[PDB]
Every structure is written in structure tokens, then in C-alpha cells.
Design a protein around this ligand. Structure first.
Ligand SMILES: Cc1cc2nc3c(=O)[nH]c(=O)nc-3n(C[C@H](O)[C@H](O)[C@H](O)COP(=O)(O)OP(=O)(O)OC[C@H]3O[C@@H](n4cnc5c(N)ncnc54)[C@H](O)[C@@H]3O)c2cc1C
Ligand SMILES: Cc1cc2nc3c(=O)[nH]c(=O)nc-3n(C[C@H](O)[C@H](O)[C@H](O)COP(=O)(O)OP(=O)(O)OC[C@H]3O[C@@H](n4cnc5c(N)ncnc54)[C@H](O)[C@@H]3O)c2cc1C
Ligand SMILES: Cc1cc2nc3c(=O)[nH]c(=O)nc-3n(C[C@H](O)[C@H](O)[C@H](O)COP(=O)(O)OP(=O)(O)OC[C@H]3O[C@@H](n4cnc5c(N)ncnc54)[C@H](O)[C@@H]3O)c2cc1C
Ligand SMILES: Cc1ncc(Cn2c(C)c(CCOP(=O)(O)OP(=O)(O)O)sc2=O)c(N)n1
Ligand SMILES: Cc1ncc(Cn2c(C)c(CCOP(=O)(O)OP(=O)(O)O)sc2=O)c(N)n1
Ligand SMILES: COc1cc(OC)n2nc(S(=O)(=O)Nc3c(Cl)ccc(C)c3Cl)nc2n1
Ligand SMILES: COc1cc(OC)n2nc(S(=O)(=O)Nc3c(Cl)ccc(C)c3Cl)nc2n1
Ligand SMILES: [K+]
Ligand SMILES: [K+]
Ligand SMILES: [Mg+2]
Ligand SMILES: [Mg+2]
Lengths: 600, 600, 218
């Protein structure tokens, strides 16, 4: 009777592949990134010429993975990856580890050899469940077609709840080829208050903030996981009159044009932001995990907030969805567990409205003034400075009546992009932060461009980073993704040569990879190519770059052996930073010249 | 007293990095493949401008991994990889899994975050020991500099003994930066009979072979792991008058010009070889693991040898170094554990010399005659057939007074290379067999070319495979490796479209990746480019290809939608194969044309 | 409960954090989670093939294990098969009680400490019907020398090993099955037996068996 109402037979007669297809539809998947192979053919046959989602074909499964990541961060939806067994699956390991570190909802479907062949070292067999265990929230191997819809639901649910992250679902070929012959629980054929412990924590947190004389908001990626996040962040900052700093992954969560913006904090963050957090009596941590790039020397981190906590007049208020990241690095004075945006809705009305903080904002404005992102400007005849390039792109990009999304590679160009872009909108900085994967920039841009077809998507890339995955240029063309790749060509692994200049007496050990001709490369890939070689080409070259309505590769020759500053050296407190100094740079240039015999 | 003789203080005062450097020397490492990064900088500083080995810089760590694999298979030495933490390390996972499946001695050294930061989700931290566990023979994280020499010795020993395979050694930054302050056991500062159970097995095996009327040697990669291997294989085949078939990985272990050669067996192997092994009363398995590509339907494999075993007049004699692979797939009548070459030295003198086997070799010669690698020849106006291309390359390559080493990508081109090359020398087929990694061809060739600077090294590649890792072209130039890349451009994932033609009614689901302009690509990479577009350019184009003394990319336009034959379909016995038939191919072409509306 | 009781039964562990078991459910849950819970023609064809092999056998033996006990009808169908095709039955240690040892067709327990009659019979049988038993190393003795007559018969297409096994992991793990019949042994016996020819007598085979039983008491 009611048993017929709780069981569903609508999938009976379908192959596992066809069931996969139907479940993608029910999960509102509109894009799949993948690459075919023997073990996953039953699924590829099922999705053949599907009009239900766009399929994006990379040149390499790592490309699929990073594309799905870019897609996920741009769209707020899970990025879906479909690959074959063996090397198809192991090729997604770096994107999976990447997604885990950066909290990216990734759902990876990997073909697998038939169940009858597992553990025999079969053709193209990898133990992907074993291998991917450490770099996924969760994984599973489907053992029969009857449980396939359930595993799919489970995968999407886990990927998108708590701290978002990657999941892998292993699909044996005989399972996806097999036909469902039995009815299954109808709940498996479909996708899907505040605890007073937390409610009391929130009230307690509000009382702490209402005492604060030097508050600061420390906002991260978590605030981006809800569309109302940035709005409520602004509402809080406005109401209680609080300066806001963000992590690298929080960039765009707060309007940096706002006077209350302290810009990015951390190792390569603003000295103003770093100074402010070191002197704040109350730190409001909104969806940020106190990563070691942000805290500096942990024992010396946030001295004023720890003092205030001990004296019952401040401390750290940590709004965090994942209990694992609460009290992992720094002790929270109050832990507010759950979605930061939801908890802010309860928090803000308990927070007293504050008109002015003369003394605090006097310090903040003074710090902002004395700590700009200073660097050595161009001189007559010199190459374009990489910092100036970023400014040019940022200024000209904001000119179009389109959303602007930025992805990056990893290295100096990445930090300069973070520093010198003006960040104003959520989900516009798409960068590999936790794992820091070189090669991320181009495929992430393709994924973001597919998520946001009407956006300007700029990959600010390094020459060494771009080399990692440049084959995916063909993928952009085939996908119809008019991405804009800007290669900051300093002909070096800049971030490593900076460390080698600094700590290894200018011994540049294998940090200069030879580059292809990027213009002939672009041409070979059927992509528009622009090369900027001198200061006088900067403005017009960047305009042509942004005006392009097709995929375009811009190469910019930029100054070499230029350090990213400010810098908080490892072991040092956040407010014990190295600032840019003109004479210091001159001396460093002379020293480098002498030690390398004029080679660098 | 003697304590001073057993302890060594010669490393005291050295950093972990410097100790690493010294241990590479002591392990006679002459080549390192790697890519720098923060966590591994102390090691890179130590090997800075080292004249003790050649350093090879890829564009991607996967490149380093596959290069090291190519190097190892060409040289018989372990391939050494040096990468940084996080993504540097996870990027070597596919090469590691590749090396495990193909028994390749790979020693991977990965930088790691400081010991003080492990398990904190630190900057660029991956659990590479956890991740790589399933795809290494063994791995370890060094915890202090005092144990670094021991772990290094242990790594090389494990990688190169038993069945060779990949090992990973994780190197925390603070360990490699730290200085050895204490003396260490002198045995750790240096690198490094037959059981009568085996001796009796050998005698028993000889008696079985001396009864055999239809013997066959089934030779694999294991015979290549000793320089005397091929010689002793030949000695055995000559003495007892035995036809020889090899696996894909055994290609070159036996002179295929020899009348006793049955060529390659298996799914895409010769129908003559497959027929012979199905009818043999005694199978001598020499360093081969009865992979599922070779056995066909296991329950129907080697019927005559199983019958002979049951009747005490034959069976399977398995010479295998790894106990795990003895009796894993098929029951060995006699298991001869240990190095196949060493055991052959004992085996052969117990084997009776045999002049003639009229009846057996009559069958073999008849099978060889009726089962050539037939295919549809070129017709006027048609594109070059991929099989003909391979023949041309093989014929012209054998013309030079240089060793010729072949690497491949994965797909149809790979099997056609295997089939249509004439294999005569050991360690000349370097191909991804167990994992089957597309993208392997180019970096493997670079590694092989570095191992063998005076060899002609040809990467027979697919267009889709080549796309995976084509960025490593720059790496070949920078390394001074004059590799010869031949892209068989059928503008398709040929091996997948073959399965889709065959099993999915010509539904080509996402199996046509767009290709770059390979000639402009080569130009952008500073590599010589040659394009062959028609039959009349084949000979002269291949000559120019082989005559080149610089890195060169040859693109050949070849016929599309051509199946690799013969084929043993999954589920079928080895002697239940599909043969090429002209009329059948014509009908298949018409059917494909009709179903795809003339598109394919 | 589902995993513990399906396939080959086995242990499962469910870890219950104190704050979870102390916590109170505040939200509705899928109603399917509040409640507990044909034959593939690949197997159907295997069964038919197995029957044809047994119908050729001149020296059959049933090798019955714990699996036959996992269904209440198991022992009944085992007896029905043994009676119909006139087959001597040996069991593992874990199969003890699956077959009435008072029955003349009982060979008692086989293996390291099993009856020499049972061990002799299985070594000389041309067809071995493995019913819910996993060919453990206490049972097979030297694996390479195990069941010589059944391997010979298989090679000659007149016998071999018919393995009724619910867990694919244990199929072809130790010895090659001539025919693998995947699934519940009792359910598959219901299909198997009617395809099996009824046999009145096996004079020569049962003469050996009775002689072995007589010369090999405990
Ligand atoms: C070369 C390089 C240099 C770098 N230098 C810097 C630097 O100077 N400054 C800097 O900031 N970063 C830097 N990083 C990046 C740094 O390593 C981290 O990736 C970054 O700081 C993490 O930012 P995050 O905490 O906001 O994001 P995440 O790492 O994603 O952490 C977000 C936190 O919020 C939680 N969360 C997620 N969703 C929610 C929700 N809905 N509600 C509540 N909580 C939620 C998560 O569980 C997590 O704890 C650098 C990276 C590279 C490659
Ligand atoms: C598209 C594709 C199609 C393929 N089709 C075929 C095909 O048709 N035919 C074919 O043969 N292959 C084919 N393969 C390759 C196949 O998957 C295996 O990789 C290959 O057959 C394994 O060959 P092998 O056993 O000789 O080498 P290995 O896999 O390396 O095994 C060697 C064995 O020898 C042992 N051994 C190693 N060293 C020693 C020693 N010193 N002494 C004794 N023993 C030792 C090893 O432990 C191991 O058991 C194909 C691959 C691909 C990608
Ligand atoms: C000191 C000592 C001495 C021993 N000596 C002997 C000896 O001489 N002889 C002997 O027999 N044992 C001996 N053993 C026991 C031996 O080690 C094994 O435990 C025993 O032989 C296994 O019997 P089994 O295969 O029937 O049961 P199991 O180990 O439980 O295996 C049952 C098989 O049937 C399968 N199965 C389960 N349910 C079903 C189903 N519904 N349908 C189909 N298949 C199913 C299972 O997956 C499994 O493969 C000894 C043990 C000890 C401690
Ligand atoms: C895959 C990988 N390998 C190595 C590193 C280590 N690494 C390396 C080698 C960097 C140099 C990047 O060079 P680039 O040209 O892309 O950028 P810049 O010159 O602007 O710094 S940055 C960095 O963190 C990494 N992050 N990712
Ligand atoms: C990294 C990876 N992804 C997917 C596969 C699956 N796969 C795919 C997609 C093949 C087609 C290879 O295309 P190709 O152009 O390189 O070669 P051919 O056209 O000559 O077959 S072959 C093969 O096994 C694989 N082996 N490796
Ligand atoms: C699409 O390209 C290819 C190439 C191919 O062999 C070279 N195969 N082989 C197949 S299969 O039928 O044998 N299935 C299969 C696979 Cl994928 C891995 C392991 C095992 C044991 C099996 Cl049974 N499917 C394939 N697809
Ligand atoms: C060479 O390029 C770079 C770039 C860089 O930060 C962006 N760093 N940071 C460093 S470090 O001194 O802080 N060491 C370090 C590393 Cl690598 C990972 C994790 C932790 C906790 C530490 Cl302590 N070394 C670096 N090298
Ligand atoms: K900024
Ligand atoms: K050949
Ligand atoms: Mg650079
Ligand atoms: Mg191709």
C-alpha cells in the first residue's frame, strides 16, 4: 500500500549511465567538465548529445578539475567532473587537493574498472578511493546501480554543506553499464533552527563587541558562500563602525573603495591591515580560518585582542561553520558555529549602533596613509613594473559595463594582483590559495567564464604558471569561452627567485624555465595575441586586451627580480614587516648584479 | 674504540640539503628531474650549479615524473624526481601510479612544510605520504636530518629490488635546512645464493619442458631488468627450439626478425601469437604478469597448457620475482621465484637441446602466414594509413647507425606502433602499459633522450595524447634533448571512437578535441616542424624527420575512424579474435557515414 | 544492519559520539530512513551450464560449507540435490550439521583434521559442487595438488568445480571455478536442481566411497 508510495520504479530499465544523466538534471547541473575513456564510456554514451547541460572538454583532466573549481567559485554551484579510470582519475588529484584546501564544492565522478577486476592491477586501474581519501571530504565506490542515485545525492550534499569541498564517486564500468531491475526508495531519487548554545554564544559575542574600542572585522571566503554574506558584512561594519580587512580568498567580500577598508592582511598584505589587527581589542573573524599566511608568528598574533579577552573587554569572535577550524590555530573568545551569514542575521541586531570612533579611526587612517602598496615606479627606459601593469588592468577593467572576474596563477603576479586590483564584488577573485597550484589560472578562468558567460574574465598569470597548463588554450576556444589571459612575463619563477635573492644570496637554482614564443603560441591555439614590451604600449595594449571579444593572450614584458612587498618574513609577528624602500632596492640590485656577475 | 669505526662524522656540519646532494653522488645519480618551490629550497640551494649530475627542468611536475620514467626505462637506473610540497608533490601522483603499474624504479623526493606545521592545513601542505601510499612500493617522511641518509638508501634499495617501482621520500623544509650535529652509523652513509626450494622447482620445471611437444615462451618486461636477460632468453629459445611471444612491455626482448618470433600477444596482439599460446602444452612465462590485456577471457586462457599440466606433460612455468604476482591470475605449474635472468642461468643447462619440432613449427609458420597484421592499404587520393606510417618510420629508423628508442602516447597509435615496428633491441619500447597514461610520450622521450644522448628517440604520439603534455616541448629544447615527436593526427581520440563505433552505434560522445596548429606550435616552442599531409610526402617527410639533429615535431595527417585489428573483444578467449577484412571495413564505413549523416 | 546481513554476513561498527546520542532531533528526516528493508541471465546461464557439467559427472561430490546454513531451506535443498543426483556429501568445520551425518552419503568433515575418506573422495572426484564454502587453507591442503581429478575433468570438458558463492571476492580466490554461480546458494539451488538429472545408482563411485569410509574411520 504505502510501500508503493515510498518506492520508485521510474528508473527501472535505465542503465547506470542513464541514471547518472537523470540525477545530474535533478541536481540542476548545467555544466560538466570531463574527458572520456574506456571505464566511463557507459556514462558518456548516456550523456551523448545531451541538451540538459553544457559539456566542457579540456586537454588534460587536471584542466577539467581546475575548470570545475573556477566554475564553482564563480557560480556558487558545485563543479562537476567526469573522468575515466586510472590516469584519468589520478590526473584530478591536484585539483581535488586544491579544492579541499580552498573549500571548493567539487563533485568528481571517475570511471573505474569492472567490479570483477578491482584489486587485480587491472588495465587502467588505480585505487582512486584510497589515493583521493586524504584530499576529499568524502569518497565512495558505487557497487551496484540500485545505490547509484543515493551515492550521487550523498556526494552533492557533502560537497555543498559544512565547509564546501571535493568529493569523489567511483563508478565501475559494469555498474554504469548495468540496468536497474528493482525499485528504489523514492527519497534516493531526489536531492534535498539555531541551537541555544549558539544563540547564547551570539548574545555573548555581541556584548563583547559592544565593549570594544578598537574592533576589526577579519573576513574570509566563508562570507562568500551566501549571497547575502557581503551585504550583512557591510551592515555590521556600518552599524558598529568597524574597519574591515579580508584574506586573499575574502577579496571582493568588502568594497575596497569604502573608507573602512583595510585591504588584505597577511604575509604580503597591507602593513595597515597587519598593524590594525595587531592592535585591535576585538577581532570579528567571519568565515576565515587563520591560515599561516595570515597570522604571521602565531604566538605573537593579535596581542591586543588576547589582552582584551583576558581582561573581559574583547577578544576573538569566530564565526565558523566547521568545528574542526574552531580553536584550531587561535583560541576563540566566542565560537559561533554555523553559517556566518545566518548567524550575522542574529548577531547584528544585538550589536549597538556606533556613530564615531575618533581615536581608533585616527590610527587607522594614519596607518592607511603611511602604508600604501609602495614600489619602485617606472623610470625612463625601464621595463614596465608588474605593479603598474596590475593597476592599469584594474583601472581599465572597471570601465566596462560588465562584471569582472579575476583568476590567477601562483607567484608574485598573484600577490600583485591581490594587492593592486581594486576589489569590489563577491566571487571575483578566483585564485589558488591553500594549496597554491601553479597552472590554475587558465583552466579556472575557462570554468569561471562558462559559469558567467557575460563576465569579463581575466587570468592574471605568471610565465612559469602559464607554462604548466597552457595546452588548455585550445579548450577555451572549443568551449567558446572568451577568456583574457595576461601573462606577466618576467622570464623567471619570480616568487622563488625572490626567496633565493633574500635567503640564498642570489643563488638562482633552477628557477628560470625557458618560455615559448607566447604570440606564436596564441596563434597556434587560434587565440588572439597581444604583446606589450615597453611603457608606451601599456595603456593601448591593455585596452585592446579588454576590448577583445574573443579568447586573447596578452604577454607583458615586466621588470625582473622585483620583490613583492610589504612582506612579513616567516617567524615574524604580523606587525614586524619589511616595507618597500627605494634605496634598499637600489642596493639590492647592485648586490645581485655583483654576485651574479651581471647576469641578473 | 670500534665504536668510532662504526660511526661516521663526515656529514656533521652539513645541511640536510647538502647531505641529500652527497647521497645522490654516492648512489651514482647522474640525472635529476625536478621543479623548485618554497618547501624544497634548502635542497635546491645545496644542488645549485652542481657539476655532479644533470638537472632537467620540465614545465610541469607530471613532466618531471614521466621524464624520470622514460629515463629509468631507457637506462636501467632509477629515475630521480625532486619537487616541492603541496601541488608540486600531488602533480607527481599520476607518474607514480604509472611507475607502479609498469614496474619502473622511480625515486620521488618531495619538499614538505616544516615538521612544526604538518597537520595544520599549512601553506602548500598535502598529505603526500597518505595520498601516494597506494601508488608507491613504499614511502616515508624524514623526521630528522640524522636519518636522512638511511631513508635515502632505503628508498633506492626498495625502488630497485624485487619488482622495481616508485618510492616517495617526504622532506620537511626544516629537516633539509637543519644541520647534522651528531655522528651517524657509517652503514647509513653508503649504498649497498639460490634456495633449494627454488633449485628443486627449477629442476622440476626443466623436466616438464623436456616433455613438451608444443612449447612457447611468453616473455615480458622482467627479462629486460637484467642486461643478460635477452641473451639468455635467446639461448633458451635456441637450445630447446621454442617460439617466442612477448607482451607490449617485453617488446625488444626478442629479435622479431628471428623465425621463432611470434610477435606480440594479447587483445591487440598477433592472432598467430594468440593462437600459439592457446594451443601450447608448455608455457614459459619469463618476467610477465599475465595482465588482462594479455590473457583474454581468463577461464578460457591457455587450454592446452592446463590440460597438459593435469596430465603431467606440461603446464605453465612462471619465472617471477614478486611472490604477489605468482598464482595471482593463472596457476603456475611450477613457480620459479627470483630474478628471471639468474634463474635462467640454472634452468637452461637442465633443458634438453632440441634440433627440430616439425609438427609444432609447421603450425606456427602456418599461423604466422595466415595472420599478418593486415589492414586496408592506401588507395588513390586517400589519406595516409596510420599502419603504413609506422612501417615507414620503422624501416627508415633502422637505417641509421644509432640505437633507436621509441616512446608512445596511449591509444591506437600506440598499438599500431607496437604492431608495426620491428622490435630488435631491449629497452627500446618505452610506453605506458599498465596505467596507460595519455601524455606520457613526450616527457618519456625527453627522459630517454637524456639517458641515451646518442640514441634516436622517437615519440610516436596521438593528437589527443600529445595535447595533454605538449608544453614539455620547451623542456626538450632547454634540456638539449633532440627528441623526435611524430603526431599521428587523426583529429580524434581514435581508441575511444573505435569503441564507440563498435559498441555504441557510432555515437561519438566528446571524443573529438580540437587540435592546435602543430606547426605553429612547434615554431612557438623553438622546435623544428614538419607536416605530412598526403601519401606523396610520406617517405621524404619521414626522412627529414629522422635526419634532423634538433628537436623536431612531425605531424602526419592519417586516415580517421580506422580500427586497430586484430582484436580480442572483452569476454572472449585469446583465440576468439576479430581479424581485418576489407569488405567488412567498407560496410563499417558506409554504416558510420549513414548513422552520422556523413559527418564521420 | 543491511550490510551486516547481506552478501557474506559480517561485522559492522557504528561509532556513537556522546553528544550525538545526548542530542535531540529537531528536524524531520526522510521516512525511508526510519524503516528497515530476480536472477541475472548471466547467472541463469551459468546454472544451466553447471547442470550440464554435473549431468556428465561419474564421480560427483558435494563440498558444503557455512553458506548453506544462511538460509533455513539450505540444508533441505542440499539434501534434495544429494538425493536426486546421488552424490556423497562432505562439509567444512563450519558446515557441520548442514547434512545429516547418519545418511550413508555422508563423507563427514574434510581437511587437515578431516576424515581421510572425505579427503580421498574430493581428491578423486571429477565434479565438485562447492556450496557456500570458501576453500580455506585448512580444507584444500596443498593448493597446487588439490582436486586433481576435478581439474583434469574440467580440462577435458566432463567435470570441474561448480562454485555457488554469494561473495565475488571469494569466487576464483583460491581455486578456479569451472562455473561460478553468484548469489545465495539456496536460491540458486532452487534453479539448479530441476536442471539436474535424477540418478538411481553409481555402483563404481559409491563402491570406492564405501570402501574409503570403512578403511578410514576416526
Ligand atoms: C603565494 C601565496 C601567498 C599568499 N599570501 C597570503 C596573504 O598575504 N594574505 C592572505 O590572506 N592569504 C595569502 N595566501 C592565501 C592563504 O594561503 C589562504 O589560502 C587564505 O588566507 C585563506 O583565506 P580564507 O581563510 O578566507 O579562506 P578559506 O581557506 O577557504 O577558509 C574559510 C574559512 O571559513 C569557513 N567557512 C566556509 N564557509 C563558511 C560559512 N558558510 N560560514 C561560516 N564559515 C565558513 C571555512 O570552514 C574556513 O574555516 C597566499 C597564497 C599564496 C599561494
Ligand atoms: C591501449 C593499450 C592496449 C594494450 N594492449 C596490450 C596487448 O594487446 N598485449 C600486451 O601484451 N599488452 C597490452 N597492453 C599493455 C598491458 O596493459 C600491460 O601493460 C602489459 O601487457 C604488461 O606486460 P608485462 O607483463 O611484460 O610487464 P609488467 O606489467 O611490468 O610485468 C612484469 C612482470 O615481471 C616481473 N618481473 C619484473 N622484474 C623481474 C625480474 N628481474 N625477474 C623476474 N620477474 C620480474 C614483474 O614483477 C611482473 O610480474 C596494452 C596497454 C594499453 C594502454
Ligand atoms: C584448530 C583448527 C583446525 C581446523 N581444521 C579444519 C579442518 O580440518 N576442516 C575444515 O573444514 N575446517 C577446519 N578449520 C576451520 C577452517 O579454518 C575454516 O574456518 C572453515 O573450513 C571454513 O568453512 P566454510 O568455508 O564452510 O565457512 P566460511 O569461512 O564462513 O565460508 C563460507 C563461504 O560461503 C559463502 N557464503 C556465505 N553465505 C552464503 C550464501 N547465502 N550463499 C552462498 N554463499 C555464501 C561465504 O561468502 C564464504 O565464501 C579449523 C579451524 C581451527 C581453529
Ligand atoms: C605546481 C607547482 N609547483 C611549484 C610551486 C612552487 N612555486 C613556484 C615554482 C612559483 C614561481 C611561479 O612563477 P611564475 O612565473 O608563474 O610567477 P611569478 O614570476 O610572477 O612569481 S610560485 C610557487 O609557489 C607551485 N606553487 N605549484
Ligand atoms: C590521461 C588519460 N585520459 C583518458 C584516457 C583514456 N583513453 C583516451 C581518451 C584515448 C584516446 C587517445 O587519443 P589519441 O589521439 O592520443 O590516440 P589515437 O587517436 O591514435 O587512438 S586512449 C585511452 O586509453 C587515458 N588513457 N589517459
Ligand atoms: C575506449 O578505449 C578503450 C580501450 C580498451 O583497451 C585498450 N578498452 N578495453 C575495455 S574493456 O571491455 O576490456 N573494459 C575494461 C577496462 Cl576499460 C579496464 C579493465 C578491465 C578488466 C576491463 Cl574488462 N574498454 C576499452 N576502451
Ligand atoms: C619560494 O616561494 C615561496 C613563497 C612563500 O610564501 C608565499 N614561502 N613561504 C615560505 S616559509 O618560510 O613560510 N616556509 C613554509 C612553507 Cl614553504 C610552507 C608552510 C609553512 C608553515 C612554512 Cl613556515 N617559503 C616560501 N617560498
Ligand atoms: K587593493
Ligand atoms: K612487429
Ligand atoms: Mg614569472
Ligand atoms: Mg588521435
Amino acid at each position: 500500500k504505502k510501500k508503493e508510495q515510498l518506492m520508485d520504479d521510474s528508473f527501472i530499465g535505465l542503465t547506470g549511465g542513464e541514471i547518472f544523466h537523470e540525477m545530474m538534471l535533478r541536481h540542476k547541473v548545467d555544466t560538466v567538465f570531463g574527458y572520456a575513456g574506456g571505464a566511463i564510456l557507459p556514462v558518456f554514451d548516456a550523456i551523448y548529445n545531451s541538451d540538459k547541460f553544457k559539456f566542457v572538454l579540456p586537454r588534460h583532466e587536471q584542466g577539467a578539475g581546475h575548470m570545475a573549481e573556477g566554475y564553482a567559485r564563480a557560480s556558487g554551484k558545485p563543479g562537476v567532473v567526469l573522468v575515466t579510470s586510472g590516469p584519468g582519475a589520478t590526473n584530478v588529484i591536484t585539483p581535488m587537493a586544491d579544492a579541499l584546501m580552498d573549500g571548493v564544492p567539487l563533485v568528481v565522478f571517475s570511471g573505474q574498472v569492472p567490479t570483477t577486476a578491482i584489486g587485480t592491477d587491472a588495465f587502467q586501474e588505480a585505487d582512486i578511493v584510497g589515493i583521493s581519501r586524504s584530499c576529499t571530504k568524502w569518497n565512495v565506490m558505487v557497487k551496484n546501480v540500485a545505490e547509484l542515485p543515493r551515492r550521487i545525492n550523498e556526494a552533492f550534499e557533502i560537497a555543498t554543506t559544512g565547509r564546501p569541498g571535493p568529493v569523489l564517486v567511483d563508478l565501475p564500468k559494469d555498474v554504469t553499464a548495468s540496468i536497474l531491475r528493482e525499485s528504489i526508495p523514492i527519497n534516493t531519487t531526489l536531492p534535498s533552527a539555531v541551537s541555544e548554545f549558539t544563540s547564547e554564544a551570539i548574545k555573548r559575542a555581541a556584548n563583547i563587541l559592544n565593549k570594544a574600542k578598537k574592533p576589526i572585522i577579519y573576513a574570509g571566503a566563508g562570507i562568500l558562500n551566501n549571497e547575502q554574506g557581503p551585504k550583512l558584512l557591510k551592515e555590521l561594519a556600518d552599524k558598529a563602525n568597524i574597519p574591515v580587512t579580508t584574506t586573499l580568498q575574502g577579496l571582493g567580500a568588502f568594497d575596497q573603495r569604502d573608507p573602512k577598508s583595510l585591504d588584505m592582511l597577511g604575509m604580503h598584505g597591507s602593513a595597515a591591515a597587519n598593524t590594525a589587527i595587531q592592535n585591535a581589542d576585538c577581532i570579528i573573524a567571519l568565515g576565515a580560518r587563520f591560515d599561516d599566511r595570515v597570522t604571521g608568528n602565531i604566538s605573537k598574533f593579535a596581542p591586543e585582542a588576547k589582552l582584551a579577552a583576558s581582561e573581559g573587554r574583547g577578544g576573538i569572535l569566530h564565526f565558523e561553520i566547521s568545528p574542526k577550524n574552531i580553536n584550531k590555530v587561535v583560541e576563540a573568545t566566542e565560537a559561533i558555529e554555523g553559517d556566518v551569514t545566518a548567524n550575522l542575521q542574529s548577531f547584528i541586531p544585538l550589536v549597538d549602533s556606533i556613530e564615531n570612533r575618533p581615536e581608533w579611526f585616527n590610527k587607522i587612517n594614519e596607518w592607511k596613509k603611511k602604508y600604501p602598496y609602495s614600489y619602485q615606479l617606472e623610470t625612463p627606459g625601464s621595463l614596465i613594473k608588474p605593479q603598474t601593469l596590475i593597476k592599469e588592468i584594474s583601472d581599465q577593467a572597471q570601465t566596462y559595463n560588465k562584471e569582472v572576474i579575476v583568476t590567477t596563477g601562483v607567484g608574485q603576479h598573484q600577490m600583485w594582483a591581490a594587492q593592486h586590483f581594486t576589489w569590489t564584488q563577491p566571487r571575483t577573485m578566483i585564485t589558488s590559495g591553500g594549496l597554491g597550484t601553479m597552472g590554475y589560472g587558465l583552466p579556472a578562468a575557462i570554468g569561471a567564464q562558462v559559469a558567467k558567460p557575460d563576465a569579463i574574465v581575466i587570468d592574471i598569470d605568471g610565465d612559469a604558471s602559464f607554462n604548466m597548463t597552457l595546452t588548455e588554450l585550445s579548450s577555451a576556444v572549443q568551449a567558446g569561452a572568451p577568456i583574457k589571459v595576461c601573462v606577466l612575463n618576467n622570464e623567471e619563477q619570480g616568487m622563488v627567485t625572490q626567496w633565493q635573492s633574500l635567503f640564498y644570496e642570489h643563488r638562482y637554482s633552477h628557477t628560470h624555465q625557458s618560455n615559448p614564443d607566447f604570440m606564436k603560441l596564441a596563434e597556434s591555439m587560434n587565440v588572439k595575441g597581444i604583446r606589450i614590451t615597453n611603457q608606451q604600449e601599456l595603456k593601448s595594449g591593455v585596452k585592446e586586451f579588454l576590448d577583445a571579444t574573443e579568447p586573447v593572450l596578452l604577454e607583458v614584458i615586466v621588470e625582473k627580480k622585483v620583490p613583492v612587498l610589504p612582506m612579513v618574513p616567516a617567524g615574524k609577528a604580523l606587525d614586524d614587516f619589511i616595507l618597500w624602500d627605494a634605496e634598499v632596492e637600489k642596493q639590492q640590485n647592485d648586490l645581485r648584479k655583483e654576485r651574479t656577475g651581471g647576469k641578473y
